[PDB]
Amino acid sequence: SHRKYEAPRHGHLGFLPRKRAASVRGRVKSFPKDDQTKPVALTSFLGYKAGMSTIVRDLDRPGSKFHKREVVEAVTVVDTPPIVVVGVVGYVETPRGLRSLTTVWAEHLSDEVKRRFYKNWYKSKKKAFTKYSAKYAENGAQVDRELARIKKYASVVRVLVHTQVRKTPLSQKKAHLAEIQLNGGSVSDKVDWAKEHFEKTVAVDSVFEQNEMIDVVAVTKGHGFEGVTHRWGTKKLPRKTHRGLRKVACIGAWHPAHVMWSVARAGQRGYHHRTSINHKVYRVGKGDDEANAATEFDRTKKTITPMGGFVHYGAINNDFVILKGSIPGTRKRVVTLRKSLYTNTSRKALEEVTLKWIDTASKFGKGRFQTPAEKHAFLGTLKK
Amino acid sequence: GAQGTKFRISLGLPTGAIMNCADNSGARNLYIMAVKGSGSRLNRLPAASLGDMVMATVKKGKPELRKKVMPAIVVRQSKAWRRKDGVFLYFEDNAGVIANPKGEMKGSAVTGPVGKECADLWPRIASNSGVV
Amino acid sequence: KVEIDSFSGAKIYPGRGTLFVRGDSKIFRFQSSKSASLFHQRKNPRRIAWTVLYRRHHKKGI
Numbered sequence: 232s233h234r235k236y237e238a239p240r241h242g243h244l245g246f247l248p249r250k251r252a253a254s255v256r257g258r259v260k261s262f263p264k265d266d267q268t269k270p271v272a273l274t275s276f277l278g279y280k281a282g283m284s285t286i287v288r289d290l291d292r293p294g295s296k297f298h299k300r301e302v303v304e305a306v307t308v309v310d311t312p313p314i315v316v317v318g319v320v321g322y323v324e325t326p327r328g329l330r331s332l333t334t335v336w337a338e339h340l341s342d343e344v345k346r347r348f349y350k351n352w353y354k355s356k357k358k359a360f361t362k363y364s365a366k367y368a369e370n371g372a373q374v375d376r377e378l379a380r381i382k383k384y385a386s387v388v389r390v391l392v393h394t395q396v397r398k399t400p401l402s403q404k405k406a407h408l409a410e411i412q413l414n415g416g417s418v419s420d421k422v423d424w425a426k427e428h429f430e431k432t433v434a435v436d437s438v439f440e441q442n443e444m445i446d447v448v449a450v451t452k453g454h455g456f457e458g459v460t461h462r463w464g465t466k467k468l469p470r471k472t473h474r475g476l477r478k479v480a481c482i483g484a485w486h487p488a489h490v491m492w493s494v495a496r497a498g499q500r501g502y503h504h505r506t507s508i509n510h511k512v513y514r515v516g517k518g519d520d521e522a523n524a525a526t527e528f529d530r531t532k533k534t535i536t537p538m539g540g541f542v543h544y545g546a547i548n549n550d551f552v553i554l555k556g557s558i559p560g561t562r563k564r565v566v567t568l569r570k571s572l573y574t575n576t577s578r579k580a581l582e583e584v585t586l587k588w589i590d591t592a593s594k595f596g597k598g599r600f601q602t603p604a605e606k607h608a609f610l611g612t613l614k615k
Numbered sequence: 616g617a618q619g620t621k622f623r624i625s626l627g628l629p630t631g632a633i634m635n636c637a638d639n640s641g642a643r644n645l646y647i648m649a650v651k652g653s654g655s656r657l658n659r660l661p662a663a664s665l666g667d668m669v670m671a672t673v674k675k676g677k678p679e680l681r682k683k684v685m686p687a688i689v690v691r692q693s694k695a696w697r698r699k700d701g702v703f704l705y706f707e708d709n710a711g712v713i714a715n716p717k718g719e720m721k722g723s724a725v726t727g728p729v730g731k732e733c734a735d736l737w738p739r740i741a742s743n744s745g746v747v
Numbered sequence: 748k749v750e751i752d753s754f755s756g757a758k759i760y761p762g763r764g765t766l767f768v769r770g771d772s773k774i775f776r777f778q779s780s781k782s783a784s785l786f787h788q789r790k791n792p793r794r795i796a797w798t799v800l801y802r803r804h805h806k807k808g809i
Binding site for chain 3: 702705707745
Binding site: 285287301303588590592597599600601609611612613 | 757758760761762763778779781808
């Protein structure tokens with residue numbers, strides 16, 4: 232027979248299959264294409280999601296009812312300790328896709344990175360990059376030929392980078408390596424750019440500017456297994472029902488005599504790799520600064536860390552990115568922030584964001600106050 | 616009919632949901648039968664929500680109003696909605712005034728307060744409104 | 748603006764806590780559910796030791 236009330240379907244098909252995703256790094260797949268006019272710059276950046284807070288911002292949408300007003304918007308905060316460019320890769324335009332030609336690295340790699348290459352660092356005798364570091368001994372003969380090789384062929388040059396995890400609050404030590412494309416005019420420039428950046432660091436301030444859309448890429452939270460109703464978002468069966476409710480009732484039908492792939496059924500939820508998109512940035516903070524949260528409007532010397540730390544995450548003692556809205560992922564989780572792949576002339580993207588205010592209150596409770604200073608004044612004082 | 620862009624608010628008054636009448640016109644209360652500008656998702660109810668015009672019926676009142684479908688507006692809600700300004704709010708009640716489709720009133724006044732959203736969306740309710 | 752609790756006197760920063768409108772069209776901003784949910788339990792601020800309105804009419808730390 233037929234459906235009867237031809238209702239729209241549960242769950243997006245495209246996002247199948249719902250695995251765990253092999254890594255816990257965002258892993259940006261696609262990067263923006265070319266710009267000969269534009270100079271060499273990192274397309275992406277690796278962060279650490281600290282958590283969230285509100286913002287109270289103006290509103291410059293002429294035509295919206297809320298034009299020229301205070302409007303609270305939620306916001307994530309992402310620690311973004313200076314990235315460390317560590318290597319270069321090459322890539323050649325084959326018929327069978329791209330293909331990495333070579334890697335060159337630094338002379339010296341931090342025990343941050345080296346640790347990545349081991350699972351039992353504590354036992355190991357830590358030979359990760361030693362006989363490689365002894366390539367450099369011969370003036371730089373083997374290295375120059377490698378970077379020449381790339382400079383010869385290589386349609387694309389991805390710069391290996393890594394995350395300062397010693398400037399975070401995370402128990403982690405093992406830094407997260409990542410390729411990230413460079414998108415400047417000419418490869419001869421890209422390679423030379425990154426040849427002048429091994430060991431050398433990269434702040435966010437360079438890559439992203441304030442008021443700029445950023446397609447954030449992450450691994451979503453977690454959950455584990457999960458029944459249909461909460462994964463696919465099907466209706467529960469009526470209370471009366473024998474053999475339980477949180478279920479799809481009728482998978483498929485007699486013929487075809489297999490359970491379709493389009494049928495909702497349970498097993499992993501979350502831990503999925505979701506690039507999201509169009510996450511506008513509201514601020515680009517700095518580590519060697521008090522009064523990070525302090526605006527043009529506020530003038531109260533306070534840090535973007537909330538009272539008593541971002542729950543779980545920790546503090547923030549660093550450069551960071553205030554992004555608008557939610558972001559896939561937890562706190563503590565690496566988030567690979569990537570430039571958008573296209574010119575938004577959405578007006579929404581173009582609005583010159585000015586933060587009027589930020590919520591620094593304790594998030595481990597219901598914080599009345601933003602600073603401890605204010606809590607002395609308000610309470611008085613005392614008794615301790 | 617509706618003067619301007621109704622910004623979204625939390626849905627509060629599904630179908631049936633009676634609500635007190637906020638106008639003097641002697642609908643003693645209104646039963647939300649159906650909602651105007653409702654979507655249509657299988658096996659979900661039409662939810663009204665403050666400002667949304669509905670098609671009420673007077674379940675209690677003077678009977679010139681009773682036993683005939685008629686439009687009305689929800690001017691009060693009680694399901695706590697969020698303003699884009701950042702606050703939440705919610706009234707002590709759900710309530711509405713009976714209306715015509717042009718957005719004009721049956722009744723010349725409106726008891727209690729009204730939501731600024733509801734005032735903004737219709738000129739006339741703001742006029743017959745006290746506190747907004 | 749930074750509003751204040753009409754139950755317990757505390758500061759209510761923007762984007763936090765409720766508002767509420769009683770039948771007389773009076774307003775009652777709350778910081779939390781605590782302050783709210785006492786007001787929706789019909790309890791007197793004057794008798795709640797953590798309010799300001801208690802700690803004013805007892806004269807605490809002025």
